[PDB]
Amino acid sequence: DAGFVDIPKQEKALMKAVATVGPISVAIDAGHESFLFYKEGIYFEPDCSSEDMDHGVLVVGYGFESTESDNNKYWLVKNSWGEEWGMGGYVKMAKDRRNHCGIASAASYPTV
């Protein structure tokens, strides 16, 4: 009756929700030039906050780069800055690296 389900603040809970529900809304800290000028690859910003998120985006999946030897998992994220930003408008956000950029801190989806 609130119209949505809140996911606990944990990347494993987020992974289970993405796998069982579909795309999930999340918020991230997008306040770094590395993200403003992002073009490709797994995005990892050492100075990202897991508490101060300022930009809503959409997790549409997750996966891993098998040719990278460690730190190789990512969230598939759809952004809203057009297709010219990132990978056709998408970014691979580091996954299972201590809730990088707060991706699991404010995750939810609507009930329909």
Partner: protein, 106 residues
């Protein structure tokens, strides 16, 4: 166990990438993307929904148009409103305008 890889775009749940322009409305694009996915999950129909309907009309639920908002406040508006218009019927203007569903004063 959860699969090792998931990509809902391959299953038809995700519309093309949009551009919020000069407006602090990412909360509305995040919320329409999650709603487009759950309406495809429910009905098998993928329809681009209106971020402008959220920017203009969800002030009662706590959002602030181009000055920021929260996806959960947009989801409360959808439940209060009984749905959300399509992008084609209520297109994006990248500025907060009047809610046509507000009678206002007469």
């Amino acid at each position: 166990e959860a699969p090792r890889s998931v990509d809902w775009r391959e299953k038809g749940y995700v519309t093309p990438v949009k551009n919020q322009g000069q407006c602090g409305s990412s909360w509305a694009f995040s919320a329409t993307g999650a709603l487009e996915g759950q309406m495809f999950r429910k009905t098998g129909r993928l329809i681009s929904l209106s971020e402008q309907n959220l920017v203009d009309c969800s002030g009662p639920q706590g959002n602030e148009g181009c000055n920021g908002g929260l996806m959960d406040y947009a989801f409360q508006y959808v439940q209060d409103n009984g749905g959300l218009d399509s992008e084609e019927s209520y297109p994006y203007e990248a500025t907060e305008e009047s809610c046509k569903y507000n009678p206002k004063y007469s």
